[PDB]
Amino acid sequence: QQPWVEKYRPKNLDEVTAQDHAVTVLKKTLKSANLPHMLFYGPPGTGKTSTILALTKELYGPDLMKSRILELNASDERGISIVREKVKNFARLTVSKPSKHDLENYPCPPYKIIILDEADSMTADAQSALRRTMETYSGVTRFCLICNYVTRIIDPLASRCSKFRFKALDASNAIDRLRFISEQENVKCDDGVLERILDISAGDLRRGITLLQSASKGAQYLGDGKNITSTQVEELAGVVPHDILIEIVEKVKSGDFDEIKKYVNTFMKSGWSAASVVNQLHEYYITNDNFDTNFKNQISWLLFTTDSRLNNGTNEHIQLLNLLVKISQL
Amino acid sequence: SKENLPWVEKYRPETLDEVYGQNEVITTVRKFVDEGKLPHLLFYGPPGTGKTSTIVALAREIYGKNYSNMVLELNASDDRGIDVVRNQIKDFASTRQIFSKGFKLIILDEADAMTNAAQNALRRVIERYTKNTRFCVLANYAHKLTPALLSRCTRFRFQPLPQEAIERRIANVLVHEKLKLSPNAEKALIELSNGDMRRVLNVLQSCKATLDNPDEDEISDDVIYECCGAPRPSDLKAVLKSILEDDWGTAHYTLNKVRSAKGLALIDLIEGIVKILEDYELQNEETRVHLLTKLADIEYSISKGGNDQIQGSAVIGAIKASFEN
Amino acid sequence: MSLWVDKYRPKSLNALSHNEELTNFLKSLSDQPRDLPHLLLYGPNGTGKKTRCMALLESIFGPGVYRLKIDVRQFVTASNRKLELNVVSSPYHLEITPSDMGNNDRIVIQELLKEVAQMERYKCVIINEANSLTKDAQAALRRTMEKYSKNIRLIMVCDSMSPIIAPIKSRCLLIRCPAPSDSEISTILSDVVTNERIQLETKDILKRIAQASNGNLRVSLLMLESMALNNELALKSSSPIIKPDWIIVIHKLTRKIVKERSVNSLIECRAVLYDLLAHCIPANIILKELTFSLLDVETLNTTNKSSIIEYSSVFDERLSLGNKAIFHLEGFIAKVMCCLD
Amino acid sequence: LQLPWVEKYRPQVLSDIVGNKETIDRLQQIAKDGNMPHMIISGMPGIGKTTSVHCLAHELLGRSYADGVLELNASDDRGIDVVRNQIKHFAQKKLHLPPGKHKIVILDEADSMTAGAQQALRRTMELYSNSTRFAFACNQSNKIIEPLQSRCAILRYSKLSDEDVLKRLLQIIKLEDVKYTNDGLEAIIFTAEGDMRQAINNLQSTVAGHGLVNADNVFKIVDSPHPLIVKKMLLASNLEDSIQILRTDLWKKGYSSIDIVTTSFRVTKNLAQVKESVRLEMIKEIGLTHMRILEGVGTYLQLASMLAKIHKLNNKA
Amino acid sequence: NKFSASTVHLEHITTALSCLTPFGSKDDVLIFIDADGLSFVRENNHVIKIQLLLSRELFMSYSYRNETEDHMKLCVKINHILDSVSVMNRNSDDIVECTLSYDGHGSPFVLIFEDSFISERVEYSTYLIKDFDTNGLELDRERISFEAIIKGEALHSALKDLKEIGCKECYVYAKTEANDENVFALISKSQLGFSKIKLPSNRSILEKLQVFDGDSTTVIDGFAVIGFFDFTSFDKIRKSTKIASKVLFRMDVHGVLSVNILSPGIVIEVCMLEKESIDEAAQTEIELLMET
Numbered sequence A: 001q002q003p004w005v006e007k008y009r010p011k012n013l014d015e016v017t018a019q020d021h022a023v024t025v026l027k028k029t030l031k032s033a034n035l036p037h038m039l040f041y042g043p044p045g046t047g048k049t050s051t052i053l054a055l056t057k058e059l060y061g062p063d064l065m066k067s068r069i070l071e072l073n074a075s076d077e078r079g080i081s082i083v084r085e086k087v088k089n090f091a092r093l094t095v096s097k098p099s100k101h102d103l104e105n106y107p108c109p110p111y112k113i114i115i116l117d118e119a120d121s122m123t124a125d126a127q128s129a130l131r132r133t134m135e136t137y138s139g140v141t142r143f144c145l146i147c148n149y150v151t152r153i154i155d156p157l158a159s160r161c162s163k164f165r166f167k168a169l170d171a172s173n174a175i176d177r178l179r180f181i182s183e184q185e186n187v188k189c190d191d192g193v194l195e196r197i198l199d200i201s202a203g204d205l206r207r208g209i210t211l212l213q214s215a216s217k218g219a220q221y222l223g224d225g226k227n228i229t230s231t232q233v234e235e236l237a238g239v240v241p242h243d244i245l246i247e248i249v250e251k252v253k254s255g256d257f258d259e260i261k262k263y264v265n266t267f268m269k270s271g272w273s274a275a276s277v278v279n280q281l282h283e284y285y286i287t288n289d290n291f292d293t294n295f296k297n298q299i300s301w302l303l304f305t306t307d308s309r310l311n312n313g314t315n316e317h318i319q320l321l322n323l324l325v326k327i328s329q330l
Numbered sequence B: 001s002k003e004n005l006p007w008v009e010k011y012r013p014e015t016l017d018e019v020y021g022q023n024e025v026i027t028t029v030r031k032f033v034d035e036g037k038l039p040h041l042l043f044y045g046p047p048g049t050g051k052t053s054t055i056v057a058l059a060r061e062i063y064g065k066n067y068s069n070m071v072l073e074l075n076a077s078d079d080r081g082i083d084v085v086r087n088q089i090k091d092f093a094s095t096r097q098i099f100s101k102g103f104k105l106i107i108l109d110e111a112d113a114m115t116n117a118a119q120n121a122l123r124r125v126i127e128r129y130t131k132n133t134r135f136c137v138l139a140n141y142a143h144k145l146t147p148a149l150l151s152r153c154t155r156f157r158f159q160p161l162p163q164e165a166i167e168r169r170i171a172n173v174l175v176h177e178k179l180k181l182s183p184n185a186e187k188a189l190i191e192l193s194n195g196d197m198r199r200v201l202n203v204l205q206s207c208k209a210t211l212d213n214p215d216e217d218e219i220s221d222d223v224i225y226e227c228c229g230a231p232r233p234s235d236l237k238a239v240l241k242s243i244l245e246d247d248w249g250t251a252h253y254t255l256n257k258v259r260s261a262k263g264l265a266l267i268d269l270i271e272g273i274v275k276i277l278e279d280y281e282l283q284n285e286e287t288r289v290h291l292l293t294k295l296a297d298i299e300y301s302i303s304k305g306g307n308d309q310i311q312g313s314a315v316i317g318a319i320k321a322s323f324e325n
Numbered sequence C: 001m002s003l004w005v006d007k008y009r010p011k012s013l014n015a016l017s018h019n020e021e022l023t024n025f026l027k028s029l030s031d032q033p034r035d036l037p038h039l040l041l042y043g044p045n046g047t048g049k050k051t052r053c054m055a056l057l058e059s060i061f062g063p064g065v066y067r068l069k070i071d072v073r074q075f076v077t078a079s080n081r082k083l084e085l086n087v088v089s090s091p092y093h094l095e096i097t098p099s100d101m102g103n104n105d106r107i108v109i110q111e112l113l114k115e116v117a118q119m120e121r122y123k124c125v126i127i128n129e130a131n132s133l134t135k136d137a138q139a140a141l142r143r144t145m146e147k148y149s150k151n152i153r154l155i156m157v158c159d160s161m162s163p164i165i166a167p168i169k170s171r172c173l174l175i176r177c178p179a180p181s182d183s184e185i186s187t188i189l190s191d192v193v194t195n196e197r198i199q200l201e202t203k204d205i206l207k208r209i210a211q212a213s214n215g216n217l218r219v220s221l222l223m224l225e226s227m228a229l230n231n232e233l234a235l236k237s238s239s240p241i242i243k244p245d246w247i248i249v250i251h252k253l254t255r256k257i258v259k260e261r262s263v264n265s266l267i268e269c270r271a272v273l274y275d276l277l278a279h280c281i282p283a284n285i286i287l288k289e290l291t292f293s294l295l296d297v298e299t300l301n302t303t304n305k306s307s308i309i310e311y312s313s314v315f316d317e318r319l320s321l322g323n324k325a326i327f328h329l330e331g332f333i334a335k336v337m338c339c340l341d
Numbered sequence D: 001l002q003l004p005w006v007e008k009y010r011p012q013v014l015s016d017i018v019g020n021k022e023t024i025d026r027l028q029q030i031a032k033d034g035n036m037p038h039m040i041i042s043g044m045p046g047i048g049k050t051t052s053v054h055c056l057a058h059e060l061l062g063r064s065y066a067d068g069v070l071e072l073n074a075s076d077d078r079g080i081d082v083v084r085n086q087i088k089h090f091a092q093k094k095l096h097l098p099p100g101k102h103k104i105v106i107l108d109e110a111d112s113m114t115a116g117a118q119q120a121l122r123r124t125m126e127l128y129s130n131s132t133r134f135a136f137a138c139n140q141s142n143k144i145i146e147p148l149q150s151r152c153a154i155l156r157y158s159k160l161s162d163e164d165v166l167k168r169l170l171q172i173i174k175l176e177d178v179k180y181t182n183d184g185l186e187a188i189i190f191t192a193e194g195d196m197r198q199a200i201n202n203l204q205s206t207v208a209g210h211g212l213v214n215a216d217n218v219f220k221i222v223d224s225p226h227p228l229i230v231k232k233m234l235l236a237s238n239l240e241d242s243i244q245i246l247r248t249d250l251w252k253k254g255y256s257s258i259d260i261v262t263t264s265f266r267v268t269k270n271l272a273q274v275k276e277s278v279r280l281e282m283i284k285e286i287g288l289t290h291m292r293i294l295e296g297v298g299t300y301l302q303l304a305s306m307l308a309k310i311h312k313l314n315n316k317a
Numbered sequence E: 001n002k003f004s005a006s007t008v009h010l011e012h013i014t015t016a017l018s019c020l021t022p023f024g025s026k027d028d029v030l031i032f033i034d035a036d037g038l039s040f041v042r043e044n045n046h047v048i049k050i051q052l053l054l055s056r057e058l059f060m061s062y063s064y065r066n067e068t069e070d071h072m073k074l075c076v077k078i079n080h081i082l083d084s085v086s087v088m089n090r091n092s093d094d095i096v097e098c099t100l101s102y103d104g105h106g107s108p109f110v111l112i113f114e115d116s117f118i119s120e121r122v123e124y125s126t127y128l129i130k131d132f133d134t135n136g137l138e139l140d141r142e143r144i145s146f147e148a149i150i151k152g153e154a155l156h157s158a159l160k161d162l163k164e165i166g167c168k169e170c171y172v173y174a175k176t177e178a179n180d181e182n183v184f185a186l187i188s189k190s191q192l193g194f195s196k197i198k199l200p201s202n203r204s205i206l207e208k209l210q211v212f213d214g215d216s217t218t219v220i221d222g223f224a225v226i227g228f229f230d231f232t233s234f235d236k237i238r239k240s241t242k243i244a245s246k247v248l249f250r251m252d253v254h255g256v257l258s259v260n261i262l263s264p265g266i267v268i269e270v271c272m273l274e275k276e277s278i279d280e281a282a283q284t285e286i287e288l289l290m291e292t
């Protein structure tokens, strides 16, 4: 009835894995009240929102969310005047008197947490107002800053907020979590399928969870009691098969422009995203030891430039064609 | 009560003797206030250098119990429109002091975030209503300030705090909290400080929270690097040596192993790499240009987002290509 | 009832002809509608991703999915100025389009999705041209479909996945819709001309239409309608391949650029670009088709083609990172004439 | 309660004002004769424009300064209707002045005043030119509309030279009886860069913080101006020397990167001994670095790369 | 409940709150609860401070159960209270009983209104984080410049006549003579020219008026006191003097002015701030027109 992304969201600070410093600091702050302003940053799908939600749940309790915890996000309007008045007001509201049930059921601290989700979408004036408000109301009000990109956040905010870097979840980082999820959901996989899924989604457990859910749904629909293989999850994710990549490399090696152009046209007719193609070509080229150092440096620079062009939101056809032409002429 | 606040706000100075590093500025402002002469001080410097803390300590020293009804503190959290500014500051400055025989101090935190007309009104009030009312300007950016404002206000520059100030503040914090750090940990904190006190206090609090027991233990550099996430100098040296010696395969393997064993970020790794590369000598004058341009493009791409492995391989290839000249 | 796309539109999973693996994938997803994650569909334009979305919605809910209702409401963006969105309504689901301006689109999506979400047997919404966003409404989407993942299911369809930010691709399942091969398009054309009892002298005309459309079902059907209506429902092998005037103008401009390389040629090319952009045609696809038209010329050598494709990529990056549209096209064309000779 | 040196020694007569000797003499003849035309004064801020206007009004009026002036400044209700009504009411009154004297209306900082208020001002001057007169004070004459500048006499103000500022410093030192040094005064002039108020503030800081005015004390209390350092590092030949200069000055003294970029842009715009192509390439690189910093990438690496690109285009390999 | 109070006659409360709406309607009122009663204070821009006090006998169910230093503070937004009370307290003779509640700290300010079997209950959450405490624009009585007691109706008429004229800058005059012809007026200057409203020496509206020599015991005759007050404070006070019985004027040599409003009735005391300096040498021409 619930997707595995939302169903298996960690509601406790001990459920999250591969994060040692931040979890330990939060756990030791649970028994104290010296909680500084936290700057949560890292790759997307790492668990910053889950971590802050678990900390808020274990700090106060379900009853105190309605009258003590308020969050900011991009779902509502965040103009300079609205943000200023709302943040100043909620940083001026008194600490609500806890009920007894919270008192002998949860270690309620004498402050409150203000959550600023996707703070990278905020203007400089709004950030200045936020930092001034959190300095002038640092007594019983705390601010949590969550952003994917550190650079967009101004330097004073990074200086005032404690920097809690979220390490990317590699294969060994979340292999245990994926194994637990598969065992709880009764998912059968071969020896090296979860590792392949984690390698596909570099530092992204949400994508791996979605891929595992899709593979489990496909296995359930197929009917036979078979184990999920690497090919199925690779083709569901969008991984280009090795034979087609070898054919692309062979076409690039040949010095024929028309063949490369028609192969690129057919590849675009196949509708495959060129980001995964660029990543696979990079992996094949650096992994292979049949090339010299200078050509490897040039092709790495070309792939980096193509990735930078693709990240801006350009036409994938033109970028991949230009990259292949440049590689073939090296 | 205290002992339940962040160390940035807990260790806020309350007197001018509690402000370290800027000895010259503190002595100059003490000499100014000892003669009863406040010439519209302007404070400029990087964040975390102690501008608003210094002005708050000065206001406490020269006024005492008059802070509640003589000091008008304005900042970005309060609306500073043209009409609002002219009305509020005109009403405050035009009114005579209640009983104290001293100048009226107005503190304007984050003065860089005001409109040009508001700045013109402020600079007119500064020269007009000045018999009893003085002005304080705090701003980290001078390009957003009218040059006329910088002329009427005496500009004081806040340099980054040297190693002595950071060491003294660390010793005071250790005395207050009964904590111990290794000299290597102290050197690592000095290197990571980059002339900032808030960052030092935040990482010290995080490292204290990291320890299982606050007492009967010593803080080393390893725990500081683990809690802060900063790469070790040995790791950066090994990565640079692998880049300069291993051609492309084992160098990439070593970089991946370094990034995977401890989960280091790419930004800090490249920052360390360029920090050691700045010490190295390059008698070509062209390799350095290529290094700087390619590295800046890499940081721009990482800020825009992308693939970490591809960016790291691009860093390796750029370094090798620049050093091949 | 007067078009191939509307009269012969499949309305079920079994009615789909091509992409049997995709049909099996959609059937597997529709086996357990309660556990359906967020979906993101990427592929070539005209493949039929909207058809797959409609078929999946019909499988999940049932009859009445294909019945649509029209309602109009206004969103206030500044003072008393308001912009209206022509939202289409339907039982058991909903569809919207990003026809608003690039800055008000974010707040329009915010208000609309907050109103639709409410509280609740969930409601599915289809996000057409999800790639056409200014990275502002995407934050609203990534927040709402994560926080309010109890009664809303955003369905994303787009042609290019690169402009979509990484978190959105992370939270949404990647659905692949490859364009059909020549044989499948030929079979579809044969079926639709069999149902329309029109004459067919040879089977090569359908193959020619499939090659001309370049794997586009909508273009193939419209071309088939054009040749059927122009030839009085009597297809002939000697009938010319009808193409839209936009592609004809692009090809003529390409031939003019190849033939003449001067300043007067440049200003006439600028006038043609202005007239083409006056037809509400995006500049990125104009540059893309201009590049493809320039690259197929046999007179040009490998070096000229490489220079042209490099300049095309550079100016596509400039257009993506820029605000105006005429400057980048003009620079690309001027650089083409500079590198031609 | 001691007033600061800037405001304690405000000139009260045109003789005490130094700088543009010809303009000061012309103002003295205007005050003596009494024929006061409409005037607009523009120039570098803090050089003695408003002070000169006030001194001229005082010398022209004497005991009539109580009512004969309507000093409307920027920090006031500077609208379109209330300002017009106030100026009309001021111009519709007569006082006992000699026939050679006229009422003076001073509008300091007329640049920020709205254009509709400028049109109302034009209406007031056209309607009541025979009785009252207007004197404008501003930094630049561009913000004043053309029709208003047509009905006045423009007197551009130049930056104060070394001689006038040094003379004023000597008079103030003699008035305050403060020990000074020639090297310290030279350092004060160098740091002021033609500014009078800044020079007075720096001298006051030097005497308060250290007493004797010495070059070392002046350099300690206030650093050298950043445009000079920017110009020094931009024309450096070797890349390493420019990198070291920018680092050891700007990053050690604590200068913001965006401020550095803006100062470099201003210096390149005002640069003289550089070719047009080199200047425009450097301007483009400055714009790219400014965009990178404004987006959020404002580290030292960006500045180092910008200097590297500038030196690469300078040397041309 | 730490503080409880009940009233049956809300007309007095609403007409006291209507005297605070010209400037205090925005926010930031610091209500005080003590053994004396209930008081509200408003201070904006640190230029004017108003205190409206409610006595014990005004409330019918004053309990005040506390076990502390007997001084608890709370700051609540006035605009929310006005918006809540505007819809209720309607018609006339609605016998709306108002119940006040405050549970010490961390609890919202609770108001209960009952009107003909219909009850209402509004909770006003407070703001007590950056409460710097102390505050107050107080003056010492040992150096009072002069004291004056005037009728409320005359002052209200004078202020309502002065408001529509303009007069962005206003002056206050004090003068005593040997022949008991005491002089007291509030003159002002505007674009219209000069505006002089004069309060005569008749004891109906000038019952007591004496000018002191800075010692509060040595009354003197023939000395003039000049008070330069902004139009804003007088405009704010005009509404407060609309309904009153006696108005007391008292300012010291420091220039701060305390005005007491009497309306048993409640007491309203407002503290004002004088301007830094008189415009040039105007005060001379004020007297020169006064005996003119």
Ligand SMILES: Nc1ncnc2c1ncn2[C@@H]1O[C@H](COP(=O)(O)OP(=O)(O)OP(O)(O)=S)[C@@H](O)[C@H]1O
Residues within 6 Å of the ligand: A004, A005, A006, A008, A009, A010, A015, A016, A017, A018, A019, A043, A044, A045, A046, A047, A048, A049, A050, A051, A147, A148, A177, A205, A206, A209, C146, C167
């Ligand atoms: N440490 C973890 N252990 C287990 N599951 C995790 C962990 N971190 C993330 N997840 C899973 O990741 C999914 C979403 O986590 P989020 O907290 O929303 O990621 P995120 O850090 O918020 O990414 P953003 O919001 O795009 S920056 C859920 O299914 C979680 O169960």
Ligand SMILES: Nc1ncnc2c1ncn2[C@@H]1O[C@H](COP(=O)(O)OP(=O)(O)OP(O)(O)=S)[C@@H](O)[C@H]1O
Residues within 6 Å of the ligand: A156, B007, B008, B009, B010, B011, B012, B013, B018, B019, B020, B021, B022, B046, B047, B048, B049, B050, B051, B052, B053, B054, B138, B140, B165, B169, B197, B198, B201
């Ligand atoms: N000289 C100093 N010695 C010791 N601690 C200092 C010093 N200067 C600043 N700090 C610490 O830095 C904290 C924050 O400094 P603030 O003065 O409040 O901010 P700031 O330095 O003015 O920077 P901004 O961005 O302009 S608010 C204080 O609470 C102190 O703990």
Ligand SMILES: Nc1ncnc2c1ncn2[C@@H]1O[C@H](COP(=O)(O)OP(=O)(O)OP(O)(O)=S)[C@@H](O)[C@H]1O
Residues within 6 Å of the ligand: B127, B148, B151, D006, D007, D009, D010, D011, D016, D017, D018, D019, D044, D045, D046, D047, D048, D049, D050, D051, D052, D138, D139, D168, D196, D197
């Ligand atoms: N020539 C001068 N001789 C002596 N003192 C001067 C001279 N020029 C300026 N000053 C001093 O500088 C102060 C400021 O002068 P102003 O006239 O206010 O500056 P300004 O020319 O009007 O430019 P602004 O006010 O920044 S728009 C005066 O009060 C004097 O103390």
Ligand SMILES: Nc1ncnc2c1ncn2[C@@H]1O[C@H](COP(=O)(O)OP(=O)(O)O)[C@@H](O)[C@H]1O
Residues within 6 Å of the ligand: C004, C005, C006, C008, C009, C010, C015, C016, C017, C018, C019, C044, C045, C046, C047, C048, C049, C050, C051, C052, C157, C188, C217, C218, C221
């Ligand atoms: N499996 C299929 N079998 C037959 N026709 C199809 C199939 N999929 C798509 N189509 C055709 O595609 C057309 C609609 O394409 P559309 O959904 O607009 O493409 P896109 O989603 O790329 O905009 C319909 O007219 C339909 O005939």
Ligand SMILES: [Mg+2]
Residues within 6 Å of the ligand: A049, A117
């Ligand atoms: Mg999140």
Ligand SMILES: [Mg+2]
Residues within 6 Å of the ligand: B051, B052, B053, B109, B138
């Ligand atoms: Mg500050």
Ligand SMILES: [Mg+2]
Residues within 6 Å of the ligand: D049, D050, D051, D108, D137
């Ligand atoms: Mg001036």
